[PDB]
């Protein structure tokens, strides 16, 4: 990840307005609805049978909050994404066996969710800067896989 | 697999795009050019600066081809065969770029139709786009 | 999609496979288990050690379904429907894994059929395996 | 890239037996035949119409030899691929605009050609080590895109 100074600032301003309690459950829940094979990893979370079932699922929303917490961290450590996600990386590879392609899908769902929330404030250059952040996180999460 | 619910969902959301169609199309392109700069390479003869009229014009075309496709979801291969020759044989567009433009279109739709872009509608659009993408790169399969 | 030329290319390589189809299906699963260890999770109850009688058995079932697919090249979706239900609905196999196994099956065929594996046969086999992959993940869209 | 010494040893021993004249042209030619959109970048090589044309094109053979020379330098700097490859990455991103997905494709194609050229000696453990190497070279080449 390399953002221009314009981009670092824009990323920062937008992140400050994000609703921590909701956007993360929204991203995770849209991941489960749009890419269904991802439900495999959350089979014990209760009813995931319909879009409303997944989205309002309390355990989905709860877990989405932690996932957004980790993004927040990476945003605070853009110059050391790798050291920041090392342990998460081991957990996702060694214990959960998630294919890293899904980290890219999740990052792209997160982008759609920021666009959904921020409308016209989510401009093409701000989207571009978030695209660099998300790919940088997917990358760091994939490091302990090989 | 453009299953009943999906179509209906797709026809419905493209419906509220209605007359914004071309501008959404052009915004989707600009978003693609700025986030995924490798894509600019297919358009050497264009001015890709924001505001760009050529991009506005191109966007309108992109948007019209999707409208047709929706109007013809059950018969996409026929409806898009010419564009599929254009894209795979003449221009050789790398297949990955279709996922990039699709992602950018969802982003543009989410940004403009929050009330309609529901999880359910997001899933159906994503599948409609994949299948439009599949038809356009079918010449490589 | 399978052009008649591809069809032919596929029948011919697959016919050279013939009796070893089962051994090659087992080898390809073993290659995939070592190369991409993430795929191991789907087989909790198997002994995945090298030479496991279980992998051999399962390799043979994979080979058969591919022999069937070659035999019904024009009607794959019909021929493989139950397999799609299994992989997509019940097992929820991540789609990216079908690319990993398709590659491993091409590497096994390359190593065992050097004279047959020409550039055009390789192209044809890749399209065919992408078509089988497409059918098996069709419930996701 | 994290290779144990046994993987290092296995990859280096095989690599010393590679006939680059044979392997290089087959690898590049196969990429152009199997994934035809890639031909767009080699329009200056001439006639790339049919498999036979690609495979007999001298420019394709020659270039494939160079590509293999770059993998050789990476095999000699397994712990510093990113550095070893920074200039080529610049070349591929800024000047050629190749999407990084194709670096993974060519890596997989090289793996099929090595199996094809070494047959049974290209065992499942040696393929596993080469998959780490081609994944690493692909990532080192995408570096400047980030
Ligand atoms: C940017 C991408 C991702 C991030 C930042 C992320 C982050 C997290 C965090 C922070 C935890 C909980 C850690 C803990 O408290 O132990 C976790 C657990 C988990 N993640 Fe992710 N993750 C991401 C992607 C994914 C994807 C794509 C999937 C699968 C489709 C996945 C599946 C899981 C599962 C199954 C758990 C453990 C849940 C449980 O059993 O309680 N993750 N993740
Ligand atoms: C949703 C998928 C797409 C659709 C519906 C679409 C639709 C179209 C249409 C309708 C045209 C004009 C045809 C004509 O005027 O005869 C066109 C041309 C073009 N498309 Fe696309 N396209 C798609 C994806 C792409 C992608 C991903 C790229 C590359 C990144 C691409 C690059 C081009 C180029 C370079 C032209 C020629 C423009 C010109 O010089 O006139 N298209 N497309
Ligand atoms: C060429 C693509 C594939 C073919 C032709 C295929 C074929 C089959 C067949 C014939 C069976 C046995 C069905 C039954 O006995 O009910 C099976 C089961 C199975 N396959 Fe696949 N398969 C493919 C890809 C994959 C992939 C990519 C994975 C995961 C990485 C996978 C995981 C499984 C599992 C876990 C089962 C059930 C095993 C058992 O419990 O007996 N398959 N497959
Ligand atoms: C990931 C592994 C790859 C390696 C190690 C590699 C290596 C190289 C090397 C050593 C050269 C010669 C550069 C020079 O003369 O200074 C080069 C040039 C080139 N590469 Fe690659 N490359 C890779 C992948 C690709 C892919 C996948 C494509 C396109 C699909 C591509 C397109 C080209 C082109 C167009 C040139 C310049 C050829 C010419 O016009 O002379 N490369 N590459």
Curated annotation (Swiss-Prot), chains A, D:
Annotated phenotype, changing residue 92 to D: In J-Altgelds Gardens; unstable
Sites carrying sugar chains: 1, 8, 17, 66, 120, 144
Keyword Iron annotated: yes
Impact noted for substituting residue 45 to S: In Cheverly; unstable
Annotated effect of mutating residue 73 to Y: In Vancouver; O(2) affinity down
Phenotypic consequence of residue 15 to G: In Randwick; unstable
Effect listed in the UniProt record for changing residue 62 to P: In Duarte; unstable
Reported effect, residue 49 to F: In Las Palmas; slightly unstable
Consequence of substituting residue 131 to R: In Sarrebourg; unstable
Effect of residue 121 to G: In St Francis
Effect of substituting residue 143 to P: In Syracuse; O(2) affinity up
Effect of residue 23 to D: In Strasbourg; O(2) affinity up
GO biological process, one term: regulation of blood pressure
Additional note from the record: One molecule of 2,3-bisphosphoglycerate can bind to two beta chains per hemoglobin tetramer.
Protein name per the record: Hemoglobin subunit beta
The species this protein was found in: Homo sapiens (Human)
Protein encoded by which gene: HBB
Swiss-Prot record, chains B, C:
Outcome following mutation: residue 120 to E: In J-Meerut/J-Birmingham
UniProt keywords, alphabetically: Acetylation, Disease variant, Glycation, Glycoprotein, Heme, Hereditary hemolytic anemia, Iron, Metal-binding, Oxygen transport, Phosphoprotein, Transport
Source superkingdom: Eukaryota
One cellular-component annotation, GO: endocytic vesicle lumen
Result after altering residue 47 to G: In Kokura; also in Umi/Michigan; unstable
Outcome of swapping residue 53 to D: In J-Rovigo; unstable
Site, Not glycated: residue positions: 11, 56, 60, 90, 99
Result for mutant: residue 88 to S: In Loire; O(2) affinity up
Binding positions (heme b): 87
UniProt effect for mutating residue 141 to C: In Nunobiki; O(2) affinity up
Effect recorded for residue 47 to H: In Hasharon/Sinai; unstable
Sugar-bearing residue positions: 7, 16, 40, 61
Residues with the N6-succinyllysine modification: 7, 11, 16, 40
Effect of substituting residue 44 to R: In Kawachi; O(2) affinity up
Result of altering residue 68 to K: In G-Philadelphia
Function: Involved in oxygen transport from the lung to the various peripheral tissues.
Additional free-text comment from the UniProt record: Gives blood its red color.
Summary of subunit composition and partner proteins: Heterotetramer of two alpha chains and two beta chains in adult hemoglobin A (HbA); two alpha chains and two delta chains in adult hemoglobin A2 (HbA2); two alpha chains and two epsilon chains in early embryonic hemoglobin Gower-2; two alpha chains and two gamma chains in fetal hemoglobin F (HbF).
The protein, known as: Hemoglobin subunit alpha
